Design a binder for this molecule. Structure first.
Ligand code: 67S
Lengths: 260, 215
């Protein structure tokens, strides 16, 4: 029924952390392989460039997610093996939330960084597949209908991170205890934002179920990339278990990003 | 109410090593159809849609019912066949990991919450009314029915457990766990297919029995 000062300040902190993280990500825009311009050469290099472009965006996204996690109150009090385990599982899910958040229903395009705007077809030209692309856009549409503000998004991201059922979580009771305040805060926040719409909160929580499916749809996508001999960079291979060496986690790239 | 919690409770009550699980599955599939019919407004949907929902949900639905059934068991689950399965057996069959996830995330949580039957049925009705299932003639209709379950369930939770402010949320937060667990179990059912199976279960794993059975 009411929002605690503590609760207000926590939400404020999360929202602030996301903007701080977005700013850092925009700094890296010049770092990205330019999206090919003109008519595609027969060399086939435009395809490889589009795929590399998207892959680099994904990398930045992972960095952005790690930066954010570190600023979520509680996250740094967990063991480093669990921090890793929680991010491995949730990265794709958060990526999808952040993706939906950048969807425009008028252009039916998603905007990455400041002004990298891409349609469904662009996604396909980048080397992703329709079985993956279509759910992404369906999910964005669904999210847009919900009409979430920056605070609701941030909260949902935090909750998603503190899912105790992820693989290799050594201290699951600790993760559920962390999750609970963020859940309580979201209940309070949404019930104050929209008192005349009680369904808003369950609606949101149920998106965490959708995201489990989409995580799986994404696994089917990785399988197709291997099949097409598209190699992924270490970080993404590590986090999603794709290629021999990096996929086993022998590089500790995520460990390092946390270490900083 | 538009989705009476009573009628949902009636539906659960109205329904009373590896191969043993598949035997148990095939039999429960029949019971599941009878359960789904007792859920408000389910039979009112288009026949093709009733089919689609049961094909999409049967897996999570069965896992939920046997998880709750096993609340009294210690380090094991109780199948509808009457047979038990224990950790030691599960690890012997290379299915130990998924088995431990079920106990940790479902059976345990259900026990500690003292999740009641009404609560179970509502969760199962939520799973059942899945508007993201492909090929539905009207996803909106299905979305609306799920949303009524949200409302009825929350109402129930505030009435019967007024002291438990976060109980409703606690219930819903089992569903993501259940979805992921459902995907892994399905995986194993496909391995058994590739390597002594029953008829109805086979139809569910295939990309007729179900049609007749709800007419
Ligand atoms: C398609 C979407 C879901 C993902 C992630 N995506 C992205 C998501 C969020 C954000 C915001 O933090 C950004 S960005 C560039 O930081 O604005 C990019 C960038 C590209 N993405 C991507 N996701 C998955 C894969 C492979 O599974 C690949 C690729 F194949 F390119 F490697 N790329």
């Amino acid at each position: 029924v009411q929002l605690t000062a503590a609760q207000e300040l926590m939400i404020q902190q999360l929202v602030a952390a996301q903007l701080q993280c977005n700013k850092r990500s925009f700094s890296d825009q010049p770092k990205v392989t330019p999206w090919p311009l003109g008519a595609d050469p027969a060399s086939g290099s435009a395809s490889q460039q589009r795929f590399a472009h998207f892959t680099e965006l994904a990398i930045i996204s992972v960095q952005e997610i790690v930066d954010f996690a570190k600023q979520v109150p509680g996250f740094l009090q967990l063991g480093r093996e669990d921090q890793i385990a929680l991010l491995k599982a949730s990265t794709i899910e958060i990526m999808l939330l952040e993706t939906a958040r950048r969807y425009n229903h008028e252009t039916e395009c998603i905007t990455f960084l400041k002004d990298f705007t891409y349609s469904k077809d662009d996604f396909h030209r980048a080397g992703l597949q329709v079985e993956f692309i279509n759910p992404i856009f369906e999910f964005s549409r669904a999210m847009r209908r919900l009409g979430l503000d920056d605070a609701e998004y941030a909260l949902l991201i935090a909750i998603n991170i503190f899912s105790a059922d992820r693989p290799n979580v050594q201290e699951p009771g600790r993760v559920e205890a962390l999750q609970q305040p963020y859940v309580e805060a979201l209940l309070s926040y949404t019930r104050i934002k929209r008192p005349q719409d009680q369904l808003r909160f369950p609606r949101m929580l149920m998106k965490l179920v959708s995201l489990r499916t989409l995580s799986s749809v994404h696994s089917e996508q990785v399988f197709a990339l291997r099949l097409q001999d598209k190699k992924l960079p270490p970080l993404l291979s590590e986090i999603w278990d794709v290629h021999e060496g990096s996929g086993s986690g022998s590089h500790k790239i995520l460990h390092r990003l946390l270490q900083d | 109410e538009e989705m009476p919690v009573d009628r949902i409770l009636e539906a659960e009550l109205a329904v009373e090593p590896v191969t043993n699980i598949c035997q148990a599955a095939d039999k429960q599939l029949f019971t599941l159809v009878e359960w789904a019919k007792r859920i408000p407004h389910f039979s009112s949907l288009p026949l093709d849609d009733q089919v689609i929902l049961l094909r999409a949900g049967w897996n999570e639905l069965l896992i939920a019912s046997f998880s709750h059934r096993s609340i009294d068991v210690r380090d094991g689950i109780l199948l509808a066949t009457g047979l038990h399965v224990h950790r030691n057996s599960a690890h012997s069959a290379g299915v130990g990991a998924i088995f431990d996830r079920v106990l940790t995330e479902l059976v345990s949580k259900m026990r500690d919450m003292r999740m009641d039957k009404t609560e179970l049925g509502c969760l199962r009705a939520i799973i059942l009314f899945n508007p993201d299932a492909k090929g539905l003639s009207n996803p909106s209709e299905v979305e609306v029915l799920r949303e009524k379950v949200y409302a009825s369930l929350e109402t129930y939770c505030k009435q019967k457990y007024p002291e438990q402010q976060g109980r409703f949320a606690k219930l819903l937060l089992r569903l993501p766990a259940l979805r992921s667990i459902g995907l892994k179990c399905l995986e194993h059912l496909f391995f058994f297919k590739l390597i002594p199976i029953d008829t109805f279960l086979m139809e569910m794993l295939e990309a007729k029995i179900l049609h007749r059975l709800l007419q």
